[PDB]
Write an enzyme that holds these catalytic residues in place. Structure first.
Site, short mmCIF file in Angstrom:
data_model
loop_
_atom_site.label_atom_id
_atom_site.label_comp_id
_atom_site.label_asym_id
_atom_site.label_seq_id
_atom_site.Cartn_x
_atom_site.Cartn_y
_atom_site.Cartn_z
N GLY A 156 -5.34 8.50 -4.66
CA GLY A 156 -5.06 7.07 -4.57
C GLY A 156 -6.11 6.30 -3.81
N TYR A 163 0.90 -2.14 4.94
CA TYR A 163 1.08 -1.61 6.28
C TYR A 163 1.82 -2.67 7.05
CZ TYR A 163 -2.66 1.49 4.77
OH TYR A 163 -3.41 2.38 4.04
N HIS A 174 -12.02 6.64 12.35
CA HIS A 174 -12.30 7.25 11.05
C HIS A 174 -13.22 6.40 10.23
CE1 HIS A 174 -9.39 4.22 9.94
NE2 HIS A 174 -9.73 4.35 8.65
N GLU A 176 -13.83 5.68 5.88
CA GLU A 176 -13.00 5.78 4.69
C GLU A 176 -13.20 7.12 3.99
OE1 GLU A 176 -10.61 3.35 3.99
OE2 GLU A 176 -11.42 3.03 6.02
N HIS A 262 -14.16 3.03 12.38
CA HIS A 262 -13.31 1.99 12.93
C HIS A 262 -11.99 2.57 13.42
CE1 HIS A 262 -12.80 2.13 8.62
NE2 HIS A 262 -11.54 1.75 8.77
N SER A 274 -4.37 -3.19 1.87
CA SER A 274 -5.67 -2.53 1.87
C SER A 274 -5.93 -1.68 0.63
CB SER A 274 -5.79 -1.66 3.12
OG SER A 274 -7.14 -1.34 3.36
O1 LIG Z 1 -4.47 -1.32 10.04
C1 LIG Z 1 -4.57 -0.20 9.55
N1 LIG Z 1 -3.51 0.61 9.44
C2 LIG Z 1 -3.58 1.81 8.87
N2 LIG Z 1 -4.64 2.34 8.34
C3 LIG Z 1 -5.78 1.59 8.41
C4 LIG Z 1 -7.03 2.06 7.94
N3 LIG Z 1 -7.12 3.18 7.08
C5 LIG Z 1 -6.15 4.03 6.70
C6 LIG Z 1 -6.69 4.90 5.81
C7 LIG Z 1 -5.98 6.01 5.08
C8 LIG Z 1 -5.33 5.51 3.80
N4 LIG Z 1 -4.94 6.57 2.86
C9 LIG Z 1 -4.34 5.99 1.67
C10 LIG Z 1 -4.03 7.06 0.64
C11 LIG Z 1 -3.09 8.14 1.21
C12 LIG Z 1 -1.66 7.61 1.39
C13 LIG Z 1 -0.70 8.73 1.00
C14 LIG Z 1 -1.54 9.62 0.13
C15 LIG Z 1 -1.15 10.66 -0.70
C16 LIG Z 1 -2.10 11.34 -1.44
C17 LIG Z 1 -3.43 10.99 -1.35
C18 LIG Z 1 -3.83 9.96 -0.52
C19 LIG Z 1 -2.87 9.28 0.23
C20 LIG Z 1 -3.65 8.64 2.55
C21 LIG Z 1 -4.00 7.50 3.48
C22 LIG Z 1 -8.03 4.51 5.71
N5 LIG Z 1 -8.30 3.47 6.47
N6 LIG Z 1 -8.18 1.42 8.13
C23 LIG Z 1 -8.15 0.23 8.72
C24 LIG Z 1 -7.00 -0.38 9.17
C25 LIG Z 1 -5.81 0.33 9.02
ZN LIG Z 2 -9.93 2.43 7.41
#
Ligand SMILES: O=c1[nH]cnc2c(-n3cc(CCN4CCC5(CCc6ccccc65)CC4)cn3)nccc12
Ligand SMILES: [Zn+2]
Ligand SMILES: [Cl-]
Ligand SMILES: [Zn+2]
Length: 340
Positions: A156, A163, A174, A176, A262, A274
């Site tokens: 995904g 959020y 982390h 991306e 970040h 996001s």
């Molecule tokens: O304000 C913030 N809050 C939370 N997170 C933030 C953030 N980030 C979070 C990720 C990981 C997002 N990622 C999506 C796909 C997932 C969701 C569940 C799932 C299941 C299978 C494969 C992938 C995934 C894993 C998880 C990256 N950046 N960056 C900036 C800001 C924020």
């Molecule tokens: Zn991020």
């Protein structure tokens, strides 16, 4: 020469500039925005992605996470506890209650001091990674659901996530997944504060984290991809890691650039949308990204399709293992040419 300071830049596009997303990303890179690893884009006042947010009370947050934090002296580890599904209504109630509401504060510096002093106490609930969008169907400008970048070639990472934050909820240090870009829009509510380390200094952060978490490092080379490591700005200052901070307010966008580390926290009840995206500059970052071997739900993208289309001359050389390309983090995307 452009943004030699690698400080977070803020942009105020006109309605005309704002209409072409990818072009505007190219424009901000021409300006050096990418050097900080994080940029803010304030949209023109006339732009709104949704008329109202009063119809989302029954929106389900399928997997809320209670965030348990352990540590001291500016170094912490965040553990996520998945809780059963709750609605935005049940969430907003907990967020605004006496137990979890934002403390009283004058300046941001005060709220930030309270955050770093209390992050291990009273674990908050984060309504994180909710598949969905709050963008109306007709919105063609900066729609997170349909960005239409070269990342679409994978299909995904292309899907939007929501959020729902509360005071003291955090995102750990982390980059991306696949060292891609990200776009974050604050739909409504209380601010979201961010810390960033310039991509040119990203290896200095990794070396510091490895020195502090050697157990975590030996188990997984890319242990920061687990998004569990919290490091205070004072620890960063103590060990000479260059960084910058910015507060994102409701109705503003944040762009994270390839290999831009970040972290941050939510000031109170809010909602952000996001997704990940790419430019031609990203392909090299995707090819060279050090990935996490162990954890589940860790994103991996086959780079083959991108190298074939945008680097055909390099395809045979790269697939062979002879591609020794060294990334210059100061260089803007090739699309930024029309502005240079
Ligand atoms: O304000 C913030 N809050 C939370 N997170 C933030 C953030 N980030 C979070 C990720 C990981 C997002 N990622 C999506 C796909 C997932 C969701 C569940 C799932 C299941 C299978 C494969 C992938 C995934 C894993 C998880 C990256 N950046 N960056 C900036 C800001 C924020
Ligand atoms: Zn991020
Ligand atoms: Cl609301
Ligand atoms: Zn791992």
């Amino acid at each position: 020469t452009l943004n030699p300071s690698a400080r977070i830049m803020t942009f105020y596009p006109t309605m005309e500039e704002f209409r072409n997303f990818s072009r505007y990303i190219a424009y901000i890179e021409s300006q050096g925005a990418h050097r900080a690893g994080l940029a803010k884009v304030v949209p023109p006042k006339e732009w709104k992605p949704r008329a109202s947010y009063d119809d989302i009370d029954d929106l389900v947050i399928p997997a809320p996470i209670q965030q348990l934090v352990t540590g001291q002296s500016g170094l912490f580890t965040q553990y996520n506890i998945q809780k059963k599904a709750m609605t935005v209504r049940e969430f907003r109630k907990i967020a605004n209650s006496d137990k979890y509401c934002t403390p009283r504060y004058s300046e941001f510096e005060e709220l930030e001091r309270k955050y770093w002093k209390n992050l291990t106490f009273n674990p908050p609930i984060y309504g994180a990674d909710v598949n969905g969008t709050l963008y109306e169907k007709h919105v063609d400008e900066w729609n997170i659901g349909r960005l239409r970048t070269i990342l679409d070639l994978v299909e995904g990472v292309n899907t939007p996530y929501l959020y729902f934050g509360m005071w003291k909820t955090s995102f750990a240090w982390h980059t991306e997944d696949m060292d891609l870009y990200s776009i974050n829009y604050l739909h409504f509510g209380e601010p979201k504060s961010w810390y960033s380390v310039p991509p040119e200094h990203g290896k200095r952060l990794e070396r510091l984290a490895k020195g502090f978490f050697p157990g975590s490092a030996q188990s997984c080379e890319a242990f920061l991809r687990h998004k569990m490591t919290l490091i205070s700005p004072l620890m960063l200052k103590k060990y000479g890691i260059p960084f910058d901070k910015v507060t994102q307010e409701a109705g503003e966008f944040m762009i994270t650039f390839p290999y831009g580390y970040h972290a941050g926290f939510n000031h109170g009840f809010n909602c952000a949308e996001s997704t990940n995206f790419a430019t031609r500059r990203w392909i090299e970052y995707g090819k060279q990204a050090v990935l996490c071997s162990c954890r589940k739900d860790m994103v991996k993208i086959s780079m083959d399709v991108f190298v074939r289309k945008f680097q055909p001359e390099r395809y045979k050389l790269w697939k062979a293992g002879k591609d020794n390309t060294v990334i210059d983090h100061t260089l803007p995307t090739p699309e930024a040419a029309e502005f240079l």
